[PDB]
């Protein structure tokens, strides 16, 4: 059988988590009381009486958003000890997560992970959902990812990240505890999808027409991406890609695994019923230079490998025409050592609609997950942000007091610098 | 069929005794007014194991109540499911025997023991099909320890061929009201080794710890502490009441578990144990009750089994199930815990099926087991015994009613024998 | 907003007691009343893991060794039913 664990670390992991688990329950017709009124697995474990329980762990050091789930509309659906909340927030301190109070949450979280990593078989992927620039997401994310790479080894891990944006930021220490967070995504991660806030901020006020996107609308759009990623696992389709061919077709070199995301068609109900949305321009709007979910101009760099998870009423003869259209375009470049670089897949269900959400149901969607050279500049903005920080050692006393040793700041500098060196070395 | 005679002695013993008669009456569908309820053949074809029929058809208990107080006798009489008990088997004794082995065994309790053997007699020779006795009592007090083991002794020379089965309540060191537990219990183990053949150790430490951890309880009342005991009591004698696939017995338990005849002290488990929060949320199957029966806390005694070695165990299952899954679960749990079983006893696991599940559940198991970690508590309360015996702590209450100091050292020497025999078989 | 405090003068009349939960989560992800649902536990107390009883007990020999015509009907209701070939082939 198939199953993926859905570890949600941090407050962003919880808020994204209750939106993706919202959508998984909607597409399988599973109510919050667990009852259907064999595709429930890869996300749900049957418990005898029709009680489908999700396969995740809600993980947050502070008891304010986990307890909100334990009092909200999903206080039933989620298993009680599956939800784990500690006592204090990590105060946007990577030392407070990875070298302080996080340990007494690691033991319980790895225990419950071990419970539901042996209740069924397969164990295809370990989905992670964390916020890089924050506190408990960066610290408890680094501890728990490093422990699973030793214990639950040789199993793929997909770290959906909410990486800090260049001009938008909600915390002044995000330059520190993101460079101090790359060293878990560089040596304990097989696939690291970079989603940020600015590029999905903009994608809602010109495509969804919403002048007030809130964080829930952000959590719905990432929920569509994770749904189309894991749709080819559960539901039967055409030529298919799952988590293991996902690594052997997007990761050319072992340490080059930082890639982007793009979803289409995100167009509201007043708007989507006017266009064709045909297979030619829904992948062409996927390769649109502003349509990525990451602030990354793709034209100061060459593409490396892309997977096109089409989902719905697509026929494989239609995808080969759209592949030919994108290749003949002279805006998207490619490296010379990758002649063919599109590993597409097609499922048969249309993407599901959320009643009350600001989307209309289309019968096909394009989610591209593309590895590009241009992702190096995304990390390079906060290379410059850390340099302004570390010149006069701002905010170090909060870090060194908890558990820090003053040298991992320079170790993280060399880890990101050697990371940038390889993106300009691969594309020659 | 096989008559089982229930006798409960002491303030503690009558409280578990009443709770046990809530549970088996729910299993057999009997109202508190005595009449039978429902159309449930599988709970009525073996009604004579614990019940007797009586003139108007009331399923009268075979239960005998002794306690030298007018204390919990009338609280269980006025309480629910207390109108079952015969208003003849209540033998009171109105003077009190507070926290003294002398006032239960040698003086005072010796005059009322001449009437409770009468009630044991006329109940048991009515039908000469007695499989065993079932004694409940605490050793950390007065009436329960003294008169409890006094009936334990005199029943054995009158029926010297049949089981007596004690669900004993041992001192429970940390939570210990009153101060004479090391004197009372240590001066009571040396009869529970000689004229006993089936002893079930129950502590209030691990009973509280089951409550605080596998149930997460905040205000564990004395009612539902006894509900855990009564569930395990009803599960260890489930085959004498219900048909099964691999039929167990109390004597099948006795012959198969105990080695050389002084090693009859057993931990007890009953492990579909969850809270009500995670009560709908559990795949209730054979491979995971085995994981829950074999991890420390779930054992009702406060002696940690991972510090010792199960010499012989039993896995008396109850419910709808398929049998090679219990057989391979016994073999693999012996395989991973090979250091926790004994090299000169192959296959240290009894198995059985009582078919009919417990009420409310769909499967369950009673894990009774001989452990060589059981001397952990024996050395614990003997250490408390010798710490008081060196300085001659409160003893004039004991010897004033008439006992010798030489008798106490015989108790400590006989109990220190039990520490050594377990050690050399470990 | 003192005009809304005229009617709850003790407020312990249970009319305004616990009638709001006013967070962004309830703004965003709710429908009709599936948050205040009582948790069904057991009708027989703390032991009973679910709802079952004497009406479901059927021991193995009774449950499978019933007469063949009854088992015949019960499973007819659930779907009971060098090489060599025929003389046609060469």
């Amino acid at each position: 059988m198939r199953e993926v664990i859905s570890i949600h670390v941090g407050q962003a992991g919880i808020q994204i988590g209750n939106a993706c688990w919202e959508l998984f329950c909607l597409e399988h017709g599973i109510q919050p009381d667990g009852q259907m009124p064999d595709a429930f697995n890869t996300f749900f474990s049957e418990t005898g009486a029709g009680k489908h329980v999700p396969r995740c762990v809600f993980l947050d050091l502070e008891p304010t958003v986990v307890d909100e789930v334990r009092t909200g509309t999903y206080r039933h659906l989620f298993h009680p000890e599956q939800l784990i909340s500690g006592k204090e927030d990590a105060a946007n301190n990577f030392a407070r997560g990875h070298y302080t109070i996080g340990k007494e949450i690691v033991d319980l979280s790895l225990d419950r992970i071990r419970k539901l990593a042996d209740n069924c078989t397969g164990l295809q992927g370990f989905l992670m959902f964390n916020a890089v620039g924050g506190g408990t997401g960066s610290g408890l994310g680094c501890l728990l990812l490093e422990r699973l790479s030793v214990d639950y080894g040789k199993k793929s891990k997909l770290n959906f990240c909410s990486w800090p944006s260049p001009q938008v930021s909600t915390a002044v220490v995000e330059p520190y505890n993101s460079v101090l967070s790359t060293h878990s995504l560089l040596e304990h991660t097989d696939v690291a999808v970079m989603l940020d806030n600015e590029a999905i901020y903009d994608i809602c006020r010109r495509n969804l027409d919403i002048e007030r996107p809130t964080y829930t609308n952000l959590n719905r759009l990432i929920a569509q991406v994770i749904s189309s990623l894991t749709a080819s696992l559960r539901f039967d389709g055409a030529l298919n890609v799952d988590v293991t061919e996902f690594q052997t077709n997007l990761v050319p070199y072992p340490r080059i695994h930082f890639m982007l995301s793009s979803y289409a068609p995100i167009i509201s109900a007043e708007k989507a019923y006017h266009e064709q949305l045909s297979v030619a321009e829904i992948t062409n709007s996927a390769f649109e230079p502003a349509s990525m979910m990451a602030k990354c101009d793709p034209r100061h760099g060459k593409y490396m490998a892309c997977c096109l998870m089409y989902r719905g009423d697509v026929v494989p003869k239609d995808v080969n025409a759209a592949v030919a259209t994108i290749k003949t375009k002279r805006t998207i470049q490619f490296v010379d050592w990758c002649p063919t670089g599109f590993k597409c897949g097609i499922n048969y269900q249309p993407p599901t609609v959320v009643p009350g959400g600001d989307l209309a149901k289309v019968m096909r969607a394009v989610c591209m997950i593309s590895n590009s050279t241009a992702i190096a500049e995304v990390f390079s903005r906060m290379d410059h942000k850390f340099d302004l920080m570390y010149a006069k050692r701002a905010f170090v006393h909060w870090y060194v007091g908890e558990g820090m040793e003053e040298g991992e700041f320079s170790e993280a500098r060399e880890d990101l610098a050697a990371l940038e060196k390889d993106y300009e070395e691969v594309g020659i | 069929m096989r008559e089982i005679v229930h006798v409960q002695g002491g303030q503690c013993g009558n409280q578990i005794g009443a709770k046990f008669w809530e549970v088996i009456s729910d299993e057999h569908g009997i109202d508190p007014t005595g009449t039978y309820c429902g159309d449930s053949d599988l709970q009525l074809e073996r009604i004579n194991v614990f019940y007797n029929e009586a003139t108007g058809g009331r399923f009268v208990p075979r239960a005998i109540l002794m306690d030298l107080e007018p204390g919990t006798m009338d609280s269980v009489r006025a309480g629910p499911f207390g109108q079952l008990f015969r208003p003849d088997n209540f033998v009171f004794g109105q003077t009190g025997a507070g926290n003294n082995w002398a006032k239960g065994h040698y003086t005072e309790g010796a005059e009322l023991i001449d009437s409770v053997l009468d009630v044991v007699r006329k109940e048991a020779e009515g039908c000469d099909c007695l499989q065993g006795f079932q004694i409940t009592h605490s050793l950390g007090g007065g009436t329960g320890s003294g008169m409890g083991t006094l009936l334990i002794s005199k029943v054995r020379e009158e029926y010297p061929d049949r089981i007596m089965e004690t669900f004993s309540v041992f001192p429970s060191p940390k939570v210990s009201d009153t101060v004479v537990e090391p004197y009372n219990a240590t001066l009571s183990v040396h009869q529970l080794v000689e004229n006993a053949d089936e002893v079930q150790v129950i502590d209030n430490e691990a009973l509280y710890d089951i409550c605080f951890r596998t149930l997460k309880l905040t205000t564990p009342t004395y009612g539902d502490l006894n509900h855990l005991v009564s569930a395990a009591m009803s599960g260890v004698t489930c085959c004498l009441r219900f048909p099964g696939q691999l039929n167990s017995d109390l004597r099948k338990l006795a012959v198969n578990l105990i080695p050389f005849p002084r090693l009859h002290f057993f931990l007890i488990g009953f492990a579909p144990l969850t809270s009500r929060g995670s009560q709908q949320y559990r795949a209730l199957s054979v491979p995971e009750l085995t994981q829950q029966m074999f991890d420390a806390k779930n054992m009702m005694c406060a002696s940690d089994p991972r510090h010792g070695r199960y010499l012989t165990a039993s896995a008396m299952f109850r419910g709808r199930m398929s049998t090679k899954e219990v057989d391979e679960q016994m073999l693999n749990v012996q395989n991973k815990n090979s250091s926790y079983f004994v090299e000169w006893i192959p296959n240290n696991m009894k198995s059985s099926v009582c078919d009919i599940p417990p009420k409310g559940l769909k499967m369950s198991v009673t894990f009774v087991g001989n452990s060589t970690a059981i001397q952990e508590m024996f050395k614990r309360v003997s250490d408390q015994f010798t710490a008081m015996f060196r300085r001659k702590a409160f003893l004039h209450w004991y010897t004033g009613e008439g006992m010798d100091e030489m008798e106490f050292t015989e108790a400590e020497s006989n109990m220190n024998d039990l520490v050594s025999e377990y050690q050399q078989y470990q | 907003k003192l005009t809304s405090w005229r009617i709850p003068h003790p407020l312990y009349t249970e009319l305004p007691q616990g009638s709001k939960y006013e967070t962004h989560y309830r703004q965003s992800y709710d429908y009709e009343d599936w948050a205040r649902r009582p948790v069904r536990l057991s009708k027989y107390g703390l032991l009973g893991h679910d709802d079952s009883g004497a009406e479901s007990w059927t021991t193995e020999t009774r449950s499978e060794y019933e007469p063949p015509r009854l088992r015949r009907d019960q499973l007819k209701a659930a779907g009971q039913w060098m090489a060599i070939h025929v003389s046609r082939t060469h």
Binding site: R75, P80 | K216, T218, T219, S275, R276, G277 | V39, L41
Partner: peptide, 13 residues
């Protein structure tokens, strides 16, 4: 505070 999610079911308050 502690097991709030449980502690209404046996005794409501």
């Amino acid at each position: 505070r502690e097991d709030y999610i449980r502690s209404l079911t046996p005794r409501p308050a």
